[PDB]
Amino acid sequence: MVIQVTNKDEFESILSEADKLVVVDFTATWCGPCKMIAPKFEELSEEYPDNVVFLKVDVDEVEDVAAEYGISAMPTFQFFKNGKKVDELTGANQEKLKAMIKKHA
C-alpha cells in the first residue's frame, strides 16, 4: 500500500493535506540496502493501512526533494505529523523501522 511520488509539488501537497502520519522511503537504484529493505517497507504499509500513509521517493527522479529534505545518506525514512517532520531513520534497519512506525502511528 505504497504511493510512488514523482514530483515536488505533489509531494509537498501530500504532506500538507495529510490527516494521517506519513512515512517516506527515500530510495535509489544505486543503493543496495534501499532495495533490501523495500519489501519490509511494503509489508508495514499493509500492516498500517488505516492511520498511516506510506510514500516512496527516488532521489534521482525527484532531485528537488532530496536536497530540500536534507537527505544525507540512503536509505532514509522520514516521518511527518500534520505536514511537519517528526522523526527520521537512516539505514536499512528493519527492526528500527518497525519500532519508529509504531512510535508515531
Give the DSSP letter string of 28-51. Answer: -TT-HHHHHHHHHHHHHHHHSTTT
| Domain count within the chain | 1
The alpha carbon of 99 is separated from its chain's Cα centroid by a whole number of angstroms, namely 14
The DSSP code for 91 is: S
Q: Is 91 in the active site?
A: no
Cα–Cα distance between 30 and 97 in angstroms, integer?
21
| Residue 56: other Cβ atoms inside 10 A | 19
The alpha carbon of 47 is separated from its chain's Cα centroid by a whole number of angstroms, namely 15
Residue 99 phi, psi dihedral angles, 5° rounding: -65, -35
Declared resolution, Å: 2.2
Q: Which residue range is the domain that position 72 belongs to? A: 1-105
Single out the catalytic residue among 3, 18, 31, 105: 31
Half-sphere exposure in the Cβ direction for 21 (13 Å, CA)? 19
Single out the catalytic residue among 5, 34, 52, 71: 34
Q: Tell me which amino acid residue 15 is.
A: L
Helix (H) or strand (E) holding 103: helix 94-104
Query: Which residues lie below 8 Å from residue 17, measured CB to CB, with a gap of 6+?
Result: 83
CATH code at position 76: 3.40.30.10
Q: Is 65 in the active site?
A: no
